[PDB]
Amino acid sequence: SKLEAILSQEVEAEIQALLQEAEAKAEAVKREAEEKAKALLQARERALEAQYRAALRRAESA
Amino acid sequence: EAEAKAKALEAQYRERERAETEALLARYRERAEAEAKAVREKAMARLDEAVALVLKEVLP
């Protein structure tokens, strides 16, 4: 009974550790997704602006 | 959301590029026609004088 109770307390500690690991993994995944979306949107907007500038330069030369 | 923002930004950038290119081509064509007509008018204003000079250089 005491050893089954100690193993149940350890199982509760392991369940808390698993919930904390799942929460930390979800937080790191959301952070990485936000960083990737920010870098992709910045790259796409800068590429659109640079293409517009180069096309305006070639059109003004013409 | 990132894909929708990218599609909207690309469409707006393409529309702004097309409109700015149309406006710049219109301004360039207007300035070209105006400067061509003005240069023709100025050359006609300065005409009929040095033709006799080139003729006197030509005639012996």
From TrEMBL, chain B:
Q: Is Coiled coil among the key words of this record?
A: yes
Residues annotated as binding Ca(2+)? 57
One Gene Ontology molecular-function label: metal ion binding
Keywords on this record? Calcium, Coiled coil, Metal-binding
Domain of life, per UniProt, equals Bacteria
In Swiss-Prot or TrEMBL terms, this protein is called V-type ATP synthase, subunit (VAPC-THERM)
Tell which residues of the whole protein are contained here: 61 to 120 of 120
